[PDB]
Assembly symmetry: D3
């Protein structure tokens, strides 16, 4: 039981807790409170003993274009602590610690904090070879977010990570496939995300047959311990280091 | 240059950036924005190339009784993320990363988050043997804050830390002295914090004569690297784990 | 629900799961299966949602004199893997990962693997100033066990640990107190462990009044993460490195004298 | 160089090479607990021999090893499994983790389960042909990660690929092995002559070591091992202890009796 | 402001500090003092607040053939501490800690300590698909240098690293590309390193347009923290462990042939 | 057991003990760069001797060692200091960090600077009497932490005490040493007979090792060392490189010429 959000729905089918970004007209751009809502959904899925997989699906041609930049305080610092710092530490933490198998259905590109979240998922399936991830921090006057400090070198390599981050270049489909970031490309048309989403769920129902599901969670629990400390450390430092960029004002100015 | 705060002042004398909690009538209890203000002062001291020591002094009989519990949101979670999570990650981070030598003049007891901050200082001087630190998390329905997860076992030992934290008992003067937590007890009366504060500064002016001050900072930089990762990791996890305690409501109920 | 063991009992009183070593006539020396039993009891306490504290108490003048050295295999290696390696790695792990507050009531000396278990507890109370911990590995032809590789330097300091371990010397009461290892000395006579055990429980019932007990567990969960990895790494290495000492035969030959 | 004999596993020394041979092709080189222990004892023996610089693990038939032999006294279920499963796994895993000689696996066919974990702990792997695969069927058996796979699989195959394969009981196939540089050379020989493959690897190795200062190999390995030695030791202890509740719950046993 | 070195030049163009190995007739082989000079140039670039990228370029058909083996002490140990240990620990540290984005323009092969420095760069661009990195330590009677203990497994994988290091085999272009080690291959002829160097700089001037350059440094500062400790630990151990190989004499005797 | 002679430092072996003796009391056992290197070579020699289980460091006179001797060709200031300071410090510090034999310091009087760092890297310290102290005067010399003090001082004395002493150039006095268990036994002998102290320590050590299985001592030390070995190796590299800018800036030199 949780409040409703017009941009994001969820349902449970058997062992699957399915989260759906449902605002395709705005490329599923997300405001601060929507990221918090996502964290609350993960925490809900995490407390449900019938759930073994948490599946994040979207809508339209984009997975998510990232933070919504369309959408009181004693200082600039106090403002940004409340608005940026808090939201980012919270949602990043919710993904880092999540105990269920986290699967992203990548129906199109993801950008920024949303793309950070994709990189925190355990398994990623792509609609087709036109998906990409973009982390435009250098263009926005920002730094790494959502644990990308750790996740990008981990999943794409350190050298590739520098090229992409330092020069604001996308991690394209080819780079994703070369690094095993995508576990399966479904090769379906971008115009039917809904069909892609349904097909992934159908294959998942097939793939879990016969498995002892608590083994999945037991294995994940050990696997997570490989990098949990690095992610926790990066979360705190990412969010605090970002502050001077917001307080300096550059990302605001750039928000044109 | 920074806004004024009636509860906390600062000044610079030579290589010393001196912060003064000046609200003795309320035992220097601090609201969220005051903790943020403290962080901003540290960040200011840290950017000043003439500053080598950041000295935190208080007033009255208490160093600080902790968070002021006398002193809109889509959910309980969103509320507490904004109010508790953000403030705590920010201020704790400001202390953890501070590059100047941090000295606390402990003019009386410190409690809770304020006492966490005392434990993050590099050097602590006590007014007299009646000072103590209390971390009442078990009584408040909360958990460790302000990096105490790491600082208390580090500076007091693991066994002593469990006895005190699990049973809501103070770290008294004797325990502080036995662990070398206090570098000097000035043995002055509790009724003149001002005299104590002045005496510490006078001794400091003497002790820095002849020293190559950049050596102090160079040494601190290496020393800090011993535990910086543990503190950063604990900061993120403390603040996120606390959330369920606030959201469950217990600390509020207890706030009687 | 678990098998009975005549050397070790347990009961639950409110939020306390109380384990009692009850073989004072043999100084509560423990065989392999007894150490395993202890691990099983911890795992039972850990699964009980009404338990917040696991309290380990003993009987007589000793907490425990350690492994009972009075008390089928293709090789010496296979034998010792089954008998020593497995038992040690299991019981040590049960202590390292335990989520309830672990309190040891130290009613007298502890030796060897039993003393290692004392050093893995979160809080230790002593009956009087004659208690000591002895880790006689250098004398037995063995090495560090039960996570002592980590726990001793952590709770006693590195230099003191080397003096004691390298020369088979006890960590005496004064050293325990100087390092805050003991949270309270009850100063009671050695002849009444029972009274000491009761007195600790009585104080604990008082001390928990008013506390939010889930906070205790929440704080412990974070505190444990400071050293959990070091303990897990040491456990694996301790048990495997011991093997060559058992297989070489020295601790056996030293046992016969 | 003295140790008991084991009809399923032989060893010999040729120059700087200590060569271990799984020789039970009729049963796909499936291994019982004591055989895994025996393997650990052989590694410890190679490790103490100052003339040995490389420890080479070779097999026979069409499989490297189908894993633990599931065809093949205790106060409790816990005591039983501590003795049988916990002890064997911690010991053999440790023997591979700490081994100081260059460990080379000659992969003559598929490996499964704990045997496949051991392949993933080797320093260098050569494949007979592109039909080899590694399968870690823990999710199907009602078990969890073993033999340091918690660390080795993400390390050598990537995290995302590891989750897909482990969570859904899918093999790490040749293509994935090649894409991740897991296999250093595919010999492209027929599956029907493991023997020829084994001999060819050794013949190339004798060529490749000519002119090398062999203590440099060990000196380098000693530094390389330190990158992950702690993570492996931590995983070993946790893997074996966490597995216990799966054995004690009984699921893997049940699943065994359903063939 | 720094001394001149006839083998290595530098200049600054906007936000780029450009270092150029300019001794193609000797395959840009470097003596101890040249490696030290390189470290000094990095430290200079690192202190210049207008610099955001430090670009290392070379000349001819090789990036660098490595340490120049053509080119007073109480002991063999004292000699090698002064000559090998000190130089290696200093230059390796200068690369590990560098705060500006470090880009290598790989105009041909690199060998040994020079190849180690390539592997410490943040981004590498290749002239064409004939480049390779060779770390011939097993052949020279040496061990890992310049942080390769960490960088090679990190950027090439553990198994590939063992094959190459244990058997003195090159990390060839295909391996580099498969691991994303090379961010762009320019596919230009080996005969014009100069054109390649110019082309990389031209693209870089384009790629930085519109970027907030302090963001680059801020991101690097966080990225570096992933492995900084492993690199610092390896540096100390690599240099000290090499010593016995030099003192034993093997690399010397191998040098004479 | 063969090495050059050094008039300032001798060594001998008595049974399982390798005993190193600083023998220059007239100059407070102050040590030049090459003497620190020599010490490292002696540790490496003791470390290779299979009959040695304990390495005992003893001195002479009223001081253990007053530290680096400041009475006692390069393309740059940087090259000079890399050769003279960096190399010497990384080498000797490393020799202590990695030493596998039980290292015992017989503290016959004060130790200062790098020599005091080396005392703090020993496993066990015995004091002649309660007038010993350790001083780390880096802040006064215009230097930073050396010889692994970055790690050893907080580890053995606590963080807060370490900041008070290092930041303000104050000694770690006997009381602080005793309170932190840094000293395992104070012999309470007069400062005028270091020799008698040295002999008494050795006599007790011969008593204390009777009946022990000495390989157990080394086996235990090997596991104990792994608690902090990484932190020490990381600190060594950073300490020596960070120091460079202090030497190159020139401050410690200036401060040297002001006696």
């Amino acid at each position: 039981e949780i409040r409703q959000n017009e941009k994001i729905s969820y349902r449970i089918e058997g062992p699957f807790f399915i989260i759906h970004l449902i605002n395709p007209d705005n490329l599923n751009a997300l405001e601060g409170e929507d990221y918090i809502y996502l964290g609350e959904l993960l925490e809900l899925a995490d407390r449900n003993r019938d759930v073994y997989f948490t599946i994040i699906q979207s809508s339209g041609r984009f997975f998510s274009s990232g933070a919504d930049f369309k959408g009181k305080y004693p200082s600039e610092t106090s403002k940004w602590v409340s608005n940026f710092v808090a939201r980012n530490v919270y949602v990043t933490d919710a993904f880092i610690k999540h105990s269920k198998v986290l699967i992203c259905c990548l129906n199109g590109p993801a950008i920024g904090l949303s793309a950070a979240l994709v990189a925190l998922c355990d398994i990623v399936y792509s609609i087709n070879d036109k998906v990409y991830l973009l982390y435009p921090f250098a263009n926005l006057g920002l730094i790494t977010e959502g644990g990308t400090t750790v996740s990008l070198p981990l999943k794409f390599g350190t050298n590739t990570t520098y090229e992409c981050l330092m020069f604001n270049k996308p991690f394209k489909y080819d780079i994703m496939c070369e690094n095993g970031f995508i576990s399966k490309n479904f090769n379906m048309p971008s115009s039917n995300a809904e069909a892609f989403n349904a097909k992934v769920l159908e294959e998942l129902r097939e793939k879990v047959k016969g498995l002892y599901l608590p083994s999945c969670l037991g294995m994940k629990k050990l696997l997570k311990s490989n990098h949990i400390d690095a992610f926790n450390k990066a979360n705190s430092v990412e969010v605090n280091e970002s502050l001077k960029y917001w307080v300096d004002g550059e990302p605001l100015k750039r928000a044109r």
